[PDB]
Amino acid sequence: MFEARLVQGSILKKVLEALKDLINEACWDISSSGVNLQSMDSSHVSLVQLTLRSEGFDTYRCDRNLAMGVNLTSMSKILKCAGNEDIITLRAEDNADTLALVFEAPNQEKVSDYEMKLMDLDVEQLGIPEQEYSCVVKMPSGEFARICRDLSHIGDAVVISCAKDGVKFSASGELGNGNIKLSQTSNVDKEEEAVTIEMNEPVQLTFALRYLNFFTKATPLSSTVTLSMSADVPLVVEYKIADMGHLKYYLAPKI
Amino acid sequence: MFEARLVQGSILKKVLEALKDLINEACWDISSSGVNLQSMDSSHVSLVQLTLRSEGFDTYRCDRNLAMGVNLTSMSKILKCAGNEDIITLRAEDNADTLALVFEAPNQEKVSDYEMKLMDLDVEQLGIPEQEYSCVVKMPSGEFARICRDLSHIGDAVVISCAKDGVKFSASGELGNGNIKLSQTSNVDKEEEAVTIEMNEPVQLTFALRYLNFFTKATPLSSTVTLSMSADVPLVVEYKIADMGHLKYYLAPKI
Amino acid sequence: MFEARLVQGSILKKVLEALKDLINEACWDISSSGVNLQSMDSSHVSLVQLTLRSEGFDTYRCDRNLAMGVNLTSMSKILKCAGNEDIITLRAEDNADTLALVFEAPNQEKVSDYEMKLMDLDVEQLGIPEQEYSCVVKMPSGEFARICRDLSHIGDAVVISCAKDGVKFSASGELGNGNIKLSQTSNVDKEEEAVTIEMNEPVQLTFALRYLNFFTKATPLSSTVTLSMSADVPLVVEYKIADMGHLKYYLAPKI
């Protein structure tokens, strides 16, 4: 038996809401150390890596490594039947072709029990080259979402320029161009309002806005986001999942 | 002649919003004891029965029993035009076949006078007698609304199974299957957000989920809903209309 | 050079919201006396005329009259990017391309520099010249908005009847008919409905409700609206924008 009881159900709701548009199907690599997902998106452009560590779960049980192939659109639909404050328990027999999802209200008067059909899929594998990056921008998650959205009216691509004297997002198109300059803070007082740049050398990279606008569906999961960049390698957009792990999205620059 | 004055016109806005999707035209039986509507949907699976007592109105007079044929699409349109806190007055002179509806804004600035056909058409008048039911379930209306909404993502039918210690709703379909068990809870005193059962013998019936989703548009009219059920007879779904009367939806099971 | 600055970002946004569904490509006349926009809408039915005097901006400089051809949907989008508390700067250097729109958030965290390509359109004019009208009605803007919206459920045309009593809007279609009567009560009254009317002779004209429902998108720009009517000429619906300027709509009555 695999069995994982997650007390804050909102978290799994949000993860599915952040993945279902970008990718339709993917295998859930389950083990004693946690749950891990790794997939390309459905247009073969970006890469996604999800991690939810075992200890994040209130109760956790994994007799042996499972791989469950999963339609995320169906999984999301089922999770929309969960409340935000439900305790969600995930359960699969060792080689069973189903995943049960139990949504307990907090007072135990209402209990729901769903049994999802798996789909049978060939796993993907990479993980990408772990790297020391030139720039790391930490910033509010709501601010990053709004920027990508604003600039998507102007252009299909965004140039992210970092230097010592700031970060800048620029886009360009048929109706013109725009530049959004977001200043580092010093003493912001809260921690989650900070804009901090860890800079080694200036960098200027171009990314497809369409894909960044997918990545920002993870905003509910965290109040900050970090962007790690270096020349000619994929951007990582990282959202922390409430002490349990993370959702990274990798994207090639143009060129 | 007919005239009924209702100071809390918000109630009548809620009833028409409850009726307009399911039923398109209906007979309005007006008498000195009040308003009684009764109709099948255009597909013959369900029946609605509405009752508004004369004493529920601020003023009421009926000279003359009347069977006004009414287009509920058109009446819901006109009611849209009413303020939330307008006084609503319904009116019919005699050998005129028109229903007038007068909305007087809260601080007598503005009177709106509306009038609609009153197409007296070949119709019905059933009733169907008092039955004794195997189960009667009372529960919060918003909770029944939620279970019908969520299960409609899974299948197009719901098995309702009643038992001493609770009621279950189960559905099955494309993306897998689902059951929601609500427990009898007692409490009472501080609120009736309870789930109570009255069980002479257990019941187990399948119903059309889309119809139950029409019925739940009445959710805003009452904090609770009752479900009376028996083998082979139509389910009743009752909503109380704040000390003026009731709204009952009737649905026959399958097989 | 042209340059204008405003603290009231919001007003600009509301002007574009109120124009952009009626007209696509527009020509802004920028002179030293201010900004002027005059155009038919894209169906050649109604006429719009916007005026924003130079004094209404808290800085204003214009060396040379410019005719800046803009797509109003694209400019509404851009202005959607700005904080409602943002300081806005409009800037152009004289012709081809660049209108620059700069949004500076209140305390210096964020600056947004946009640049809109201008197309070459001729500066229109015609400026149909003023008149004394049989009848001039002034009323709450949100009440005028609500009357057009509601009657649009009954009919496609409204008949405005002005009289010493007050003003009456009446519409008629398939479902039946409706009239709304606002009366002149005296003075010193709490209700915000002091509908006032300056009158030479009762008028009675019909108007397409589709277009009136375009003109009420200006509702946020002012709390009152003034209607000016005579037989055989266009209605004028005027929103005064706070001694900054005005937005006028012209619609001819049905024959």
Numbering used by the authors:
A (entry chain C), B (entry chain A), C (entry chain B): 1 to 255
Can you provide the manuscript's text about this entry?
Monoubiquitination of PCNA represents the key signal for the switch between high-fidelity and specialized DNA polymerases to bypass a variety of DNA lesions at stalled replication sites. As a first step towards understanding the Ub-PCNA/Pol η interaction, we used EM of single particles to determine the three-dimensional (3D) structure of the native Ub-PCNA in complex with full-length Pol η and DNA. A molecular model of the Ub-PCNA/Pol η/DNA ternary complex was constructed by rigid-body fitting of crystal structures into the EM map. The structure mapped the location of the C-terminal domain of Pol η, elucidated the mode of interaction of the DNA with the complex, and captured the conformation of the ubiquitin competent for binding to Pol η.
Not only does it regulate the activities of both replicative and TLS polymerases, it also acts as a scaffold to recruit various cellular proteins involved in DNA repair and cell cycle regulation. The crystal structure of the PCNA, which forms a toroidal trimer with pseudo six-fold symmetry, could be unambiguously fitted into the map in a distinct location. PCNA instead of Ub-PCNA was used initially for fitting, considering the multiple conformations of the conjugated ubiquitins on PCNA adopted in existing atomic structures. Cross-correlation coefficient was used to distinguish the current fit from the one obtained by 60° rotation of the crystal structure of PCNA along its pseudo six-fold axis. Consistent with the presence of DNA in the complex, the central hole of PCNA is partially occluded by a conspicuous density, reminiscent of the DNA passing through the ring. Importantly, this density adheres asymmetrically to the inside of the PCNA ring when the map is rendered at a slightly higher density threshold, implying a non-uniform interaction of the DNA with the PCNA ring. Intriguingly, our model suggests that the DNA backbone interacts asymmetrically with the central hole of PCNA, only forming stable contact with one of the PCNA monomers. Furthermore, the DNA transverses the plane of the PCNA ring at an oblique angle of ~13°.
